């Protein structure tokens, strides 16, 4: 039982996995087995969702988070996001579940049967964390793999059926992307946009051409970077800037993942392009705007002049100006005027919402959609009672946008905490005082008094 | 075919359960490793074959 | 009669599983019969 | 719904997603067996 107790390893049972830091074979096993767990969940959860799936109910009324991911890719759906064929979901589920057996097999083998260290067995697979070049090489392999992934999304979009496009002319539908945005001014332009209101950084991406072109750029960048890191070794300045150890690299990755988690939280909360409202439900902004639309339609049918109707505060009851003058919906939803969605845009002119189009051009499908979204706002209790906090039991609903946002905020936060933990520890261990202060060499005792 | 399908799938589930318990026990057991190893090979090949059989027969029952 | 015949880890495992079963039942009951809102 | 041929496995499919959680609990059963050394 090599290194498998606190006395030999220096680590207690509750930190048992730290016993794996310099045991590359077993650690490889832990990693592969963990990947197995992930893939397992994707497959099993997909089959579970499918079994519980009623095709004529919206997805978002059914507690689905994976089927939406598949449908967004253009599998199984047609015009308006209607399910025309569930077989693709079945396929994704089964194939992930089967693959998880393979991964688990490898993981278990390397973890309890294979060579505990890889170094004496193979120069290629063996490594020293402190070997900077080997680290950059493996980093490179993995970058090339990621780049290939991004390109697989590009291939789906351009050559294998397309993607679901909520913005397609004539109504949402699956569409083939033939002209991805390649212009770097557009692509990296998103990267330089403010993350505040009306800008929203990369979260503002609002068309599939930009999504696809962006993925072309990311694919090429990742492959090029991978080659770079295979062919080079870290420069002097990097060598002097970083801590070079397993726990340090782990801490770096933990910070990166925390960042990505916060970003994904915002993406699923605000974006309705790569998270189509057909599949995920309306955004919070979307549903608020939809209420305003709904009552404008009702009152105007009754005979109200919605342009000139003055509300109790002096602001327009239905319509008002944004701080830069655009015509927007009134009431509290004044906050959400940056909202954009395919059911609303046809009423939009150069100066914002257009009163003539509002008076004459609102179609029954727009009324329907606004009613649907208004009554599927992402508000609901922990036990899945839909609606505001004071609503009575009756509707079993919590929006997938809420589930996704909340889960990923929690995960991102604890991952920031983990970054602090492992970064601070890596620093202390590299310097040699992670176990405590040397009584015979307490640094503060050699320092001058503060006063 | 439906019979052949259902039975092949039952076989896959049963075998999977057997492997799930037996593979880690064999890996960590002191004795009888040669027979164990032979059996793990056999079980793996059969597992793969069964997945393929269910996969193909799926389209003649669905 | 004397301590040790039934390993503690087995006792703990079975005890814990029992806890999981009973609490699981209590959560089931939140969705069915009295208190279910239906 | 799964395709009809697979309907008999419905109770099984209902249980699958929780299995990963069982691995975390298994680590504790294992550690208890070696005295948390």
């Amino acid at each position: 039982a090599t290194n498998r107790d606190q006395e030999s390893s220096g680590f207690a049972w509750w930190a048992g996995n730290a016993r794996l830091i310099n045991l590359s074979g077993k650690l490889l096993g832990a990693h592969v087995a963990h990947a197995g767990l992930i893939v397992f969940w994707a497959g099993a959860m997909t089959l579970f969702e499918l079994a519980h799936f009623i095709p004529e109910k919206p997805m978002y009324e059914q507690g689905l988070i994976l089927i939406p991911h598949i449908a967004t890719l253009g599998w199984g759906v047609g015009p308006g996001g209607e399910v025309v064929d569930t077989f693709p979901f079945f396929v994704v589920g089964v194939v992930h579940l089967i693959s998880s057996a393979v991964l688990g097999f490898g993981g278990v083998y390397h973890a309890i049967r294979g060579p505990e260290t890889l170094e004496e067995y193979s120069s290629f697979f063996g490594y020293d964390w402190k070997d900077k070049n080997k680290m950059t090489t493996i980093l490179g392999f993995h970058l090339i793999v990621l780049g290939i992934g991004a390109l697989l999304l590009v291939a789906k979009a351009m050559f294998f059926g397309g993607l679901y496009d909520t913005w397609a002319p004539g109504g949402g539908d699956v569409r083939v992307i033939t002209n991805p945005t390649l212009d770097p001014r557009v692509i990296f332009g998103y990267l330089l946009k403010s993350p505040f209101g009306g800008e929203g950084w990369i979260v503002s991406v609002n068309n599939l051409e930009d999504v696809v072109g962006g993925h072309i750029w990311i694919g090429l960048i990742c492959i090029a970077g991978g080659i770079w890191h295979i062919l080079t070794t870290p420069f002097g300045w990097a060598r002097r800037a970083f801590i070079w150890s397993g726990e340090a690299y782990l801490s770096y990755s933990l910070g990166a993942l925390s960042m990505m988690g916060f970003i994904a939280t915002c993406f699923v909360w605000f974006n309705n392009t790569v998270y189509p409202s057909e599949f995920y439900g309306p955004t919070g902004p979307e549903a608020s705007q939809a209420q305003a639309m709904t009552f404008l339609i009702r009152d105007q049918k009754l005979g109200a002049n919605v342009g000139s109707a003055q509300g109790p505060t002096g602001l327009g009851k239905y319509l008002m100006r944004s701080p830069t003058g655009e015509i927007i919906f009134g009431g509290e939803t004044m906050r959400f005027w940056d909202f954009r969605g395919p059911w609303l845009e046809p009423l939009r002119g150069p100066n914002g919402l257009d009163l003539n189009k509002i008076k004459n051009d609102i179609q029954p499908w727009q009324e329907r959609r606004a009613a649907e979204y208004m009554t599927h706002a992402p508000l609901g209790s922990l036990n899945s009672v839909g609606g505001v906090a004071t609503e009575i039991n009756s509707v079993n609903f919590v929006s997938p946008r809420s589930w996704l946002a909340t889960s990923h905020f929690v995960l991102a936060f604890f991952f920031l905490v983990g970054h602090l933990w492992h970064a601070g520890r890596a620093r202390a261990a590299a310097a040699g005082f992670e176990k405590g202060i040397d009584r015979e060499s307490e640094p503060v005792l050699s320092m001058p008094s503060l006063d | 075919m439906t019979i052949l399908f259902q039975l092949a799938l039952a076989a896959l589930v049963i075998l999977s359960f057997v492997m799930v318990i037996g593979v880690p026990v064999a890996y960590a057991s002191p004795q009888d490793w040669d027979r164990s190893k032979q059996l793990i090979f056999l079980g793996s090949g059969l597992w793969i074959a069964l997945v393929l059989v269910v996969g193909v027969l799926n389209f003649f029952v669905v | 009669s004397e301590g040790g015949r039934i390993p503690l880890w087995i006792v703990a495992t079975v005890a814990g599983m029992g806890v999981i079963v009973i609490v699981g039942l209590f959560f089931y009951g939140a969705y069915a019969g009295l208190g279910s809102s239906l | 719904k799964l395709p009809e041929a697979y309907a008999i496995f419905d109770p099984l499919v209902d249980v699958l997603p929780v299995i990963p959680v069982l691995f975390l609990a298994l680590a504790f059963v294992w550690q208890a067996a070696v005295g948390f050394r």
């Binding site: - | 960590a28 002191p30 | 390993p7 599983m17 | 249980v15 929780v18 069982l22 059963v29 070696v34």
Partner: peptide
């Protein structure tokens, strides 16, 4: 409903059964 519980019983016992079997045979836990 009984089927679900049966499944999770077998599945649920699989993990502890492996530890038990290894413990009995003095395996490399």
């Amino acid at each position: 409903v009984i089927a679900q519980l049966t499944m999770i019983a077998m599945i649920g016992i699989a993990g502890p059964m492996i530890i038990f079997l290894l413990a009995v045979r003095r395996g490399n836990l």
